[PDB]
């Protein structure tokens, strides 16, 4: 299968990116420095780790894949790759596997060194809850990263130049992390006798950073819909990215 | 569901002071929120709770007793008027539960009856502020 033969490239090319390895080191340092000041000073520190991995796992995903399609079109290899025995689906899906296992490893160095700083600085942490609250944490942080990976394929395929891809990937990172929730807070303060209280939990499903925190805080909705709503953000935006990539 | 003042039980604690409501004379306010009803041991303790900025924006109906149609030692649940459209008298020598004695009325002449019978002044709901509750309680339980 050539979806794996093009996936082995993106592992070898993504792990030598100096821009990624600075951020993945800074993600692992700050995950220790929160865990050090969460133990010396486990649900109280997994909420501060959720605010950390909402900052950086969209940033890691957009640093990897903002130049996945348009970076190959500018490099000229994209026109070369289409003349190989390869569909346009297998190029995108193979990049999604290759970029997906990078930030599936960046949470295993990220939280693998954070859970070590919890299991060795609490002395009585009751580790049977640790390997289930971090197993639900490492899976949900990867799925958050796979959304913004699929968001990065949408904005890479739309633009025609590498400089305007980073101008939109910064715009997507501003909008989906810290502008959409600020206009939620703004709506409440400006309008308090008109806005529906019930509507806001449902309106939280239009933001995958918000769905990420709701599966680390365990509410009118159940838990199982949020797993199928985070996977729906992957499956729609990858299908949207495949629909854009077939129109170049 | 905010239109319904629920009745008082004997095992009903106040929202603020937490003690038993029906062991006291005077009118007993309560606040129906339409997400959960919270009750108060005195009307002055309800108005002390209402003037906090957490509850200014809170959409909740306030209900107090009608002391123009009830005996002051044991008020029935019964007629329970809306507290915004009431006529509170202040400064009387009656012994309420917690705050100053704020006998609530609905007809304003019975409020004028108790005002001249004890030396008090009728005042509306919007004239109640936290400068007045602490002034009236100091004249009642002080000196």
């Amino acid at each position: 299968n050539q979806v794996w033969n093009i996936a082995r490239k993106e592992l070898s090319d993504g792990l030598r990116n100096r821009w990624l390895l600075a951020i993945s080191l800074l993600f692992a340092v700050l995950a220790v420095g929160i865990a050090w000041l969460g133990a010396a000073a486990i649900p109280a520190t997994i909420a501060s780790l959720a605010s950390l991995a909402t900052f950086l796992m969209p940033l890691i995903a957009l640093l990897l894949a903002y130049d996945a399609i348009v970076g190959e079109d500018e490099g000229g290899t994209l026109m070369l790759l289409l003349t190989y025995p390869l569909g346009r689906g297998q190029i995108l899906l193979g990049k999604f596997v290759g970029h997906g296992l990078i930030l599936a490893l960046a949470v295993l160095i990220g939280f693998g060194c954070a859970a070590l700083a919890i299991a060795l600085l609490v002395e009585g942490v009751e580790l049977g809850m640790l390997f289930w609250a971090f197993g639900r944490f490492m899976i949900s942080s990867t799925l958050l990263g796979w959304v913004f990976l699929a968001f990065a394929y949408v904005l890479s395929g739309k633009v025609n130049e590498k400089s305007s891809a980073a101008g939109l990937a910064l715009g997507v990172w501003f909008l989906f992390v810290l502008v959409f929730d600020l206009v939620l807070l703004a709506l409440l303060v400006l309008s308090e006798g008109k806005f529906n209280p019930e509507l806001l939990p449902w309106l939280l499903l239009l933001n995958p950073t918000d769905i990420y925190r709701l599966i680390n805080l365990s509410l009118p909705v159940p838990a199982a819909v949020l797993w199928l709503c985070l996977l729906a953000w992957i499956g729609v935006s990858l299908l949207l990215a495949y629909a854009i990539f077939r129109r170049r | 569901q905010s239109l319904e003042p629920v009745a008082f039980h004997d095992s009903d604690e106040c929202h603020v002071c937490g003690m038993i409501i029906t062991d006291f004379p005077g009118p007993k306010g309560q606040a129906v929120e339409k997400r959960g009803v919270k009750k108060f041991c005195s009307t002055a303790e309800m108005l002390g709770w209402w003037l906090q900025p957490e509850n200014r924006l809170l959409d909740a109906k306030l209900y107090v007793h009608d002391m123009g149609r009830s005996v002051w030692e044991k008020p029935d649940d019964g007629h329970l008027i809306d507290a915004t459209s009431a006529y509170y008298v202040v400064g009387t020598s009656l012994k309420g539960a917690m705050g100053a004695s704020l006998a609530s009325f609905a007809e304003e002449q019975d409020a004028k009856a108790l005002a001249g019978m004890h030396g008090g002044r009728v005042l509306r709901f919007e004239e109640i502020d936290q400068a007045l509750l602490q002034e009236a309680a100091s004249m009642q339980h002080g000196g």
């Binding site: 409440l188 950073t209 | 095992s11 603020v16 900025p53």
Partner: protein
Amino acid sequence: APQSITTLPLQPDGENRWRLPAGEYQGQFTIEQPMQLRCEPGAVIQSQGQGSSLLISAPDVLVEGCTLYEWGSDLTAMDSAVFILPAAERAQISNNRMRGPGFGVFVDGTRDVQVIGNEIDGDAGVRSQDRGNGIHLFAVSGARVLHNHVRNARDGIYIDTSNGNHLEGNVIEDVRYGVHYMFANENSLIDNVTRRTRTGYALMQSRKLTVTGNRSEQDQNYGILMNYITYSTITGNFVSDVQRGGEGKALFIYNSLFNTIENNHFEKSSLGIHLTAGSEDNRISGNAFVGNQQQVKYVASRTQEWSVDGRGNYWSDYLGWDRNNDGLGDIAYEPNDNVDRLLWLYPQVRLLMNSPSIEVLRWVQRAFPVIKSPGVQDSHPLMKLPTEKLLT
């Protein structure tokens, strides 16, 4: 209802002083003469379950060492264990054991009564709505209730309109209210210990009183509740770990205008201090707010300085320095942000409380001080623990 003369008291001294021997008795009993009766340790005066067991109507009675059991429970007719009439002035009830479903020591209209060293175990099955008061005091001037041990009553030491009296060194366990105060002007209470209580200290409408040195161990939902107290004094109280069962507030100041709140120790609670909007401008300086998950709750936009004479409080989460070596900190300490009061003003923001945008808004206040609402700050906070003696 028989009398105390219907028993067999052996006189040790001929100055109306009697001594009851060891052996059980039955029924209610009444003191009508100034008898300084003592008791042997086997004097189990067990009533049958009705009426006030030991009614006292005579002045100057030194009741000592008795053991009362199973009196009535009609709280409306005040079925007490020790009923003390208004004419029974200066009664001493010393070192007694009580077990019965009503009032332990009900006094009313009395002067200079001394309720010392008793052990009053209230009930086990009644729903803490009909258990009766441990030590009920109803408008007494001069009382001295010292070093008792009240357990499992209803609302502990209830006090109604009693002017001048001391509450010294008494241990109160597993009750609804620890010490209840109703309209008790110019009161005092020292060094009391309250354990596992649904409100540690009820201070309702009592002015000019001194609350000093008291301890509150593992109470439920309210450490010290003060409603409408003026010119009071709160010095040296130790309120520790008030868990929920309210969310748990070590001190809840509601409509208290003037009072000095110094040298306290609010430890390991959910809320260190709740300051309502009506209770403003009172001297709060020198306390220790250690280990609380949220120190001050103050839902207002009015500024509130918490430091008289340049000395503030010790805060555990005070991340400050001290360059010039005095006890005071160098930077001021705001205990509340603007986003810490949006959570209280709008409870729907709890869904958004872990967002990075909220974490952005905590940093924007530290960089741009125009958006800082005027809060509950204290210039010059303390650097070290001022309550070095209360931890022992």
